[model samples]
Target: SEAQFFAPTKESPYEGIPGRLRYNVRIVLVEQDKQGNYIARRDSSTVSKRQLAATVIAAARYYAQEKRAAVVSITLDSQPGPAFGKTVLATATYAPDGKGVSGSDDWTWNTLQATPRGLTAQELKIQCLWGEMRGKFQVDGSTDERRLKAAIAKKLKIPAEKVMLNPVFPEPFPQEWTR
Candidate 1:
């Protein structure tokens, strides 16, 4: 519905990364914990759901753009795994009439809605793509971490405190971590 939304190289001007993505991100809310095990914690962060979702959306959009792609979709790969390198092994979709469908081949009648973002049907596909590309040499870590943080901070116009790096794998590691 909006032009220039998917152009991150251009939209990195005002609205951060969310403005760069063509698709909108809607965070999923739950009344209970994952696996329906623990009751939902009462001490969740006291941030507005909308704002928190926006921050996550911004991060995801920027991550996608860093790979020279637009943020067309987002989906939950798993719970409490590594913060980074999350993956979606499978995806399921449903028809408009509410019947379940299988495989990514169905597009017209079935659409991906497990992470719905207003009618876009590519959420699972995009997640799979991300999972495949999750880890590898993306950034140079031999430099000062502070300078890297400052660079990202300047790009997003956010303070360094908000820019946290949760690198799942570090360089110069043993071969066991590699796939």
Candidate 2:
């Protein structure tokens, strides 16, 4: 088991309103067996605490929507940066439908008492993936579009070129048509 993660401060590194916090929020997903063996897991880019929590919630919701499991464990790690130091934020172990056993859902959010903090370049990519996957946002043809699409393809376990054309979603959003 790793150290307990906690959230970082939201204070701007600079001084005032214009300033933004400079820290990365890492989201880790893991599946542990009865014998404490990890079976599968995934993670995402550094993002703001807001984005981090949102992504965590989205991840849990995704699992529930897919009827994956009774509980989803998400760890939030507060990485070092110019604004705030390194620390473990918290683990958000959510029972989406409130049906999981407390024996497994021991983890909780807000283990550390730090204010949440801003978005990073990689965080934007992470958000794009989740937002587009959930039909919350649309592609804007940025350079990172290709990389994000590729990442999404890998997640969907499909060819890179098929993410936009495949029937992964209710309605196919073809990439070739957009290009």
Candidate 3:
């Protein structure tokens, strides 16, 4: 449950409080060393899994810049909760071409598996558009707020006015990651 996943703040239940936001979600970045031994780093100070993913991308981008190697794996996990301990939400890996990232959400896949039937053509098209836009946003890192919003809207086939930019999207542009 999202409510269980996120704790309430003093100001509002829906939003987290400033300086007291939960950093429960953990992100683990793993890479193999020369001798085949694995090296791992754990970060549990981010506000959300999405933020962790972006941070992972930035770290991976830096590694790629320095070592000329793509990121090996990224893991998103939950903290201890009432229902159970840690749960693996999703995992993303590089595609066969070594450029694209492909992901499978455990919960989403289980739900889909239960249903068995797949997405419609329109839904699949929208998913593809979203994936492309997400990739563009991750790599481009353009600080121009209006430009990014317009580009996203163009891909979504919607008016620019219809798009809403989130607070996190503006500050951390591409240069931040590349640098």
Candidate 4:
């Protein structure tokens, strides 16, 4: 069966991410490297992105399932930069357990964190939880997003638009603020 995409921003149930993005969904065993006086690393793996996304989605799914809902809301842009893209690369959806995910968040962010050099999966995860994907839920849209959506649809034999959805479209997140 295809995973149904729902717009939490527009929909009734998932207007805001249940709790603090940092505490709500967490990635385990993410390592950090020290560079000079500061820590530096990258998380450019397709597999890792998928894992984090899957973990978050799994949580959303669990909540939705408890409510007997067929759909769940996911903030696809949670991961910073192209961490979502690098880790998950060109795919979508996961099989619950971490093993079935695409790349290892541990390594993938290296290739995508760019600018002053990319970031580690741990860093990317932090950014997702603290920085961009923190406030409100949103949809995925990046160079990686475009490629991945297309690839996922092609591999799963599903229409690109059906699987690769920017569910909320123009307004991926809502008007709620934490302050």
Which model scores highest in TM-score?
Answer: 2
Question: Ten residues in a row with the worst lDDT in model 3?
Answer: 107-116
- RMSD of candidate 3 to the truth, in angstroms, is 20.4
Per-residue error at 148 for model 1, in Å?
A: 46
Please, what is the TM-score per model? 0.21, 0.28, 0.23, 0.23
Clashes of each: 0, 6, 1, 27
Evaluate residue 59 in candidate 4 and report its C-alpha lDDT on the 0 to 100 scale: 43
- The number of clashing residue pairs in model 4 is 27
Better of 1 and 4 by TM-score: 4
Ranking, TM-score, top scorer first: 2, 4, 3, 1
Candidate 1 error regions (>4 Å):
1-45, 76-179
User: Which of the predicted structures, 1 or 3, would earn the higher lDDT when compared with the native?
Assistant: 3
The local distance difference test score of each candidate is: 0.30, 0.36, 0.33, 0.31
lDDT of 2 at 153: 69
Model 3: residue 123 alpha-carbon error in angstroms: 33
RMSD of each: 18.0, 17.8, 20.4, 18.0
Q: Which number leads on lDDT? A: 2
Q: Considering only N, C-alpha and C atoms within 3 Å, which residue pairs clash in candidate 3?
A: 141-174
Q: Could you give candidate 3's per-residue lDDT for residues 1-179 as a string of tens digits? A: 01112211111111133322111123433435589775432222233434443543433333334433322332343322222223333333222223332222221111000011112323333333443454445545544546655786787786766544211121221323212
lDDT of 1 by residue, 55-171 (tens): 334434454455443333333222213433232211112122122122223231222222112111122222233333335324554435465556655755767665433311111
Candidate 2, which segments miss by more than 4 Å at Cα? 1-48, 79-86, 103-115, 118-179
